[PDB]
Enzyme design. Structure first.
Site, PDB file in Angstrom:
ATOM      1  N   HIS A   1      23.858  39.903  55.804  1.00  0.00           N
ATOM      2  CA  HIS A   1      22.570  40.502  55.416  1.00  0.00           C
ATOM      3  C   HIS A   1      21.806  40.752  56.700  1.00  0.00           C
ATOM      4  CE1 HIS A   1      23.693  37.977  51.953  1.00  0.00           C
ATOM      5  NE2 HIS A   1      23.043  38.845  51.197  1.00  0.00           N
TER       6      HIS A   1
ATOM      7  N   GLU B   1      26.626  45.085  43.383  1.00  0.00           N
ATOM      8  CA  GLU B   1      27.189  43.799  42.995  1.00  0.00           C
ATOM      9  C   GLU B   1      26.495  43.269  41.742  1.00  0.00           C
ATOM     10  OE1 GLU B   1      27.468  41.064  46.195  1.00  0.00           O
ATOM     11  OE2 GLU B   1      27.978  39.344  44.880  1.00  0.00           O
TER      12      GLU B   1
ATOM     13  N   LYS C   1      25.491  40.641  38.628  1.00  0.00           N
ATOM     14  CA  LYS C   1      25.416  39.218  38.359  1.00  0.00           C
ATOM     15  C   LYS C   1      24.618  39.083  37.102  1.00  0.00           C
ATOM     16  CE  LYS C   1      24.317  34.779  40.498  1.00  0.00           C
ATOM     17  NZ  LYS C   1      23.571  34.091  41.615  1.00  0.00           N
TER      18      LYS C   1
ATOM     19  N   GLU D   1      32.087  39.943  41.954  1.00  0.00           N
ATOM     20  CA  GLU D   1      32.313  38.608  42.483  1.00  0.00           C
ATOM     21  C   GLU D   1      32.929  37.735  41.403  1.00  0.00           C
ATOM     22  OE1 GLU D   1      29.472  36.661  45.010  1.00  0.00           O
ATOM     23  OE2 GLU D   1      29.508  34.859  43.707  1.00  0.00           O
TER      24      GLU D   1
ATOM     25  N   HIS E   1      30.501  35.559  39.464  1.00  0.00           N
ATOM     26  CA  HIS E   1      29.464  36.265  38.680  1.00  0.00           C
ATOM     27  C   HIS E   1      29.956  36.678  37.302  1.00  0.00           C
ATOM     28  CE1 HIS E   1      27.035  37.410  42.525  1.00  0.00           C
ATOM     29  NE2 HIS E   1      27.165  36.101  42.352  1.00  0.00           N
TER      30      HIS E   1
ATOM     31  N   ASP F   1      34.244  40.252  46.157  1.00  0.00           N
ATOM     32  CA  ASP F   1      33.825  38.935  46.646  1.00  0.00           C
ATOM     33  C   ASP F   1      34.673  37.883  45.917  1.00  0.00           C
ATOM     34  OD1 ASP F   1      31.809  39.944  48.294  1.00  0.00           O
ATOM     35  OD2 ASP F   1      30.155  39.143  47.043  1.00  0.00           O
TER      36      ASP F   1
ATOM     37  N   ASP G   1      25.598  29.466  39.587  1.00  0.00           N
ATOM     38  CA  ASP G   1      26.567  30.075  40.482  1.00  0.00           C
ATOM     39  C   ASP G   1      27.014  29.030  41.519  1.00  0.00           C
ATOM     40  OD1 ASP G   1      27.703  32.289  41.970  1.00  0.00           O
ATOM     41  OD2 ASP G   1      25.871  32.620  42.947  1.00  0.00           O
TER      42      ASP G   1
ATOM     43  N   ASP H   1      32.738  35.153  49.445  1.00  0.00           N
ATOM     44  CA  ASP H   1      31.288  34.875  49.278  1.00  0.00           C
ATOM     45  C   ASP H   1      31.239  33.510  48.660  1.00  0.00           C
ATOM     46  OD1 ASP H   1      28.638  34.594  49.055  1.00  0.00           O
ATOM     47  OD2 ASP H   1      28.350  36.247  47.549  1.00  0.00           O
TER      48      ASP H   1
HETATM   49 CO   LIG Z   1      28.443  37.856  46.284  1.00  0.00          CO
HETATM   50 CO   LIG Z   2      27.789  33.745  43.576  1.00  0.00          CO
END
Ligand SMILES: [Co+2]
Ligand SMILES: [Co+2]
Ligand SMILES: [Co+2]
Ligand SMILES: [Co+2]
Ligand SMILES: [Co+2]
Ligand SMILES: [Co+2]
Ligand SMILES: [Co+2]
Ligand SMILES: [Co+2]
Lengths: 386, 386, 386, 386
Positions: free
Chosen positions: D53, D180, D182, D216, D219, D244, D254, D286
């Site tokens: 990031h 991404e 979630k 991910e 997720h 991920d 998570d 990740d």
């Molecule tokens: Co991720």
């Molecule tokens: Co996560």
């Protein structure tokens, strides 16, 4: 309407309205609150009292003179407002030393320190008038199978609770313990994950009468369980020593929404059961005003916890008092559920041809339970649609 | 390799390999199996025994002459194969009369009938040599809050279990009871939803020594719980009287996949704990070959339950015996977890400055637990990648 | 009050009030209902119409003369009552031939048969006036990873839907398709498990305009999702062609409780969104009266679906119309959420120092969202506690 | 064995091995890592690259001279080790200004700032060679129903992504976006909660070809979904731009466990699908080394992510190459699943009596799918028990 007053016995943790909004992915959104200001604001809303972890009231690592001054200011705020302190607890989860547990840490020195930290705060809790001392073992557990032998961990957890019972007995204190289950978060699995596991564990302590449970709405809902049913089993066992009220949307991270948010019908049946059973303990809120809120939103969220309890109390009382509901409960045989199955005794049951040989199974199977009409009367009462 | 033999104590319910494939949305995909054929096929696979509900062995509503012939054929198949019957149970869930429960039905006549039906099958279970009598109260519970007062239902459930204990004591039978928790399905919430709630309930029966739990892998996983941790608490309490082995993918309908399917690492840690603890009861499979399968797939699925247990038994034994794992377990302080916290006693702990005043909290916090290296040795052993 | 009339567009599947109560662990608790009687009873309650699977209206394997007579009796009941048939669907899940799927069965002959069975019932649906043809692929999926290559299964599912679109276009029919997602049950995982996956799939069909979604409250809640948020994304995409209303308690087997049961606040926000958005399709109930009920309880449960929708419609309208709520929505910047971020365009945003270099991040972070006061006004409106 | 090298394309976020261990209930357990040290340590383990990031590489609020020095040191570590930077992303979730979202914040000034912050880091990502730019909208969503109108929020989210596509096109950059999903955490419900919802949303952007998904493992598992099935639908749509990898135990917070932990069989089927499909993107982790660990445990956990991928790659390749598995796949008709249903066309299907009138439904229903034998060959390969 629905105005709470201190006679409703609503209490809040300092860490609830004082939560600064830090989460796994986010920095604080609100400044820290002085406990003196939270006592004054909560009393203005009509709360009865407050609760604390040791480290919420006295910063970790304080000197004796700092400790004395923090406690003196807090006592002055309690005296200025008439607020009580019915419950206190230990923080055995924030400091990195507790990363593998307090009472069930693999490191023995950490387990001994966790006990000493707890005992120091039991003395303070008794000083401040607390009747209940909560223990939430949020760090007791594991993320992997080899890290934690659970039979050895339960042996350590029983030793710890037994030593705390020996300490309170040795001091002649009247305070009792309430163990708070949670199934996971922050550990991948937490030991004593539900009300049932905590109740079962207590029966193996040396002085079980000193210990009960402090169930939390959202914790049992994180396992997908029915929170009113678990409170009924705790009441059945005589072990509901304290309760934490909040909201949760099912199986997720612990949301700590205000009470009445999350599963609203479960909140209705919970209030119906606590009021029906004559539960006399504090109605304690363990919640977090969402981090979207400023301080005005913190106090609005706290006020909403109490308002929702009082609305649900009115609607559950009207449901139980309605002659039409009382007739529906007899149509659904709730009265027969409360009668003994075989007060006549085992031999009489064995000799009763009406229980087997001459039992008309098809006639009994054909009789509807009338549960949907009963539940729609409950819905109509909750929504004010009678 | 991994060939089971009757000495491995693998057992299967008649209703497992005999499941015809009917589900909430689907008709049967396989013909009914005669219990005589399931005993012969399971023995050929290396099973040790079989278990039954009353109604799996004797069709509901059979005459005495029909009952005698069904039992005589079944006994001949057991004698022809050397198969045992270690456990039996009652079907208190299929017939519509049990739509609101057996032991906790709101209708009192239904509760009495459920007891008589159970008692008749306890006598048969003892005739066939069973040591354990399971009770899965799948219909005990509710879809709505007003339908079932849970404190009254627990009073009825305790009366029922107490009467069954009085019956077995009166007959001088050696058989013990194993209560099987499940959190939901077919009722919206089932009473005694987890191992913990069942353990807690047993402590309030009049003769608790007669009752333990029969936990099922998939049932605790339907609440998102850690099944090895719940088995450890049942072992800690001395109450693992029987166990049901299968697979489940988390929080869903009860899938009843073959053992080793669903959560494979949980299956590994379960076998590691049962073998470490010296559990000596049957390794019973309560599973359903998927309805996609023909009979060849039924026997392949049953064989896979036993094969997966034996692979996991080998890998868990190799993990615990590996000197590198034994060194990793001491690096992670599993040895210190098994030592008493304060065998020196409460006063010595209170007087120990190394537990508080001179405890270097930062040095203890800095010490890593080394759990990830330990868990990757566990992974490497499970996968045969050492 | 809250009396439905046919103008409210409430519809019910024949299989809802006609469910006989068979579940994974239980036999039927009610006799079969003639569709003629369900049409008459539902019309008396104020329903607008009914829906059917092929096999609910015409028993599987019927001769042409039997088919004609079943349809003639049903048409007479519709004409006698004024009931409509807005939607129909195919049963591609009950018969054992569909044990691995209809459109994505591994057996190619089964896939072709599933298409022919669907096409025969599209013709009947159009005869009876249906505007929407639902497809719930409950058998499309797997219990194990090797059984189903999902890219090949999606290729078969696209071929099937494309052929159905070519058929309706070739016949000049006006009917459109609505794909119904579900994440699991009866398969261990079902293909197109949520509204999002179904919306994404539709965009790859050859004539996407012919297809939308038929989301069901309980199905999205079986994945722990927010059903109002998924309906908002379907509305945003122009694809809410039909909706199934019921209740569910989170992540479990599909409970199919009456609408308003399960997650009551989600039912409130759903009705608020459908009414705000001017959704004009049927308000269809896909539910099951619990098997505890007799026929009187079946009709009480059906009546409760409609009553709860109408109570929630009144409370959501009062919430949106209340000047105090309108002021709270502006205090929480719901008006600013509805304004374009950068109608000035990309270059203007890049040149705007108020969006970066001179943006006072701390002043914006300090501004509370006032969401808790807004949500407690919503709670007060839902409960009739203003 | 199972030694990774940079040719395996394993990558890690700076924030993964750099996670200091702060959680909802706990302070940091590890000191901060300099990105230069994480690049050197990861390269020693055999990683191919790292991702960041903006705020992991350049502390928030840095001056231009500080920014230049942080980037210069990081570039030197990349050059010293040969590590790449295939992906970068923006932190639109930690700072309190994003408490209600970045791109879908109710405050319009916040939405504009989120875009400017993203655009500044796209330029840096391209400088460092990134091909993929991830967007995880962790703050987009709500805890309450009135706080967020989801159709207006999707309009803002489309405007934001469209403006980012116009920016990259205007600059002639080759970089593509990966959204991404979630389902929840940190918001009570997050917008675009699953792979399906993100895929559906992308189809409504102005230049859909510029956007794919970055799913991910954990997720999708937080919604109880099958992660390999969702990756198959993303591959089917041509949209798997990045992935991920980590571990999760079902429906919880998570957990971000190392890859191969959590659902091991799902990890096996995921690797089998990525390798079968010839996915050529980074294998990005990740994850978070648990906060119980010291730095030695951080690097052991990172090494275990890569080791588990390489073990599973070997076992999935051996499964697909085994002649016995290839015969089992034809016995289960996986070959027929990959053949078109009706390449003969709609009219030929309609005229084919073998698809309806002369289809022997009972003979097709009787044919077993042989899925259990196939799945136990898969189990045997995964466990090295052939
Ligand atoms: Co991720
Ligand atoms: Co996560
Ligand atoms: Co909580
Ligand atoms: Co709490
Ligand atoms: Co089961
Ligand atoms: Co079982
Ligand atoms: Co459903
Ligand atoms: Co439906």
């Amino acid at each position: 309407n629905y105005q709470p007053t201190p006679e409703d016995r609503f209490t809040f943790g300092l860490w609830t309205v004082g939560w600064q909004g830090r989460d796994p992915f986010g920095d604080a959104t609100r400044r820290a609150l002085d406990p003196v200001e939270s006592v004054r604001r909560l009393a203005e809303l009509g709360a009865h009292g407050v609760t604390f972890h040791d480290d919420d009231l006295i910063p970790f690592g304080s000197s004796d003179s700092e400790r004395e001054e923090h406690v003196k200011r807090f006592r002055q705020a309690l005296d200025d407002t008439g607020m009580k302190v019915p419950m206190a607890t230990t923080n055995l989860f924030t400091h990195p030393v507790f990363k593998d547990g307090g009472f069930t840490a693999n490191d023995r020195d950490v387990r001994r320190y966790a006990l000493r930290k707890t005992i120091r705060n039991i003395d303070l809790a008794v000083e401040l008038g607390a009747e209940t001392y909560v223990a939430w073992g949020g760090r007791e557990g594991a993320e992997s199978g080899g890290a934690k032998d659970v039979r050895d961990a339960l042996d350590r957890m029983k030793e710890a609770f037994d030593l705390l019972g020996e300490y309170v007995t040795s001091q002649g204190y009247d305070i009792r313990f309430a163990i708070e289950p949670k199934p996971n978060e922050p550990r991948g699995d937490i030991l004593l994950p539900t009300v049932g596991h905590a109740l079962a564990f207590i029966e193996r302590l040396e002085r079980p009468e000193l210990y009960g449970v402090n169930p939390e709405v959202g914790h049992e809902q994180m396992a997908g369980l029915n929170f009113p049913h678990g409170i009924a089993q705790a009441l059945w066992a005589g072990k509901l020593f304290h309760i934490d009220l909040n909201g949760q949307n099912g199986i997720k991270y612990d949301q700590d929404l205000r009470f009445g948010a999350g599963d609203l019908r479960a909140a209705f049946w919970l209030v119906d059961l606590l009021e029906s059973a004559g539960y006399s303990g504090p109605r304690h809120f363990d919640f977090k005003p969402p981090r979207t809120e400023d301080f005005d939103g913190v106090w609005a969220s706290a006020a909403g916890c109490m308002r929702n309890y009082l609305i649900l109390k009115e609607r559950a009382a009207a449901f139980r008092a309605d002659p039409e509901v009382q007739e529906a409960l007899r149509a659904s045989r709730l009265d027969e559920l409360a009668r003994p199955t075989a007060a006549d005794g085992l031999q009489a049951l064995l000799d009763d041809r009406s229980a087997f040989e001459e039992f008309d199974v098809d006639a009994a199977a054909a009789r509807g339970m009338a549960f949907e009409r009963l539940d729609q009367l409950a819905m109509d009462h909750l929504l004010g649609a009678r």
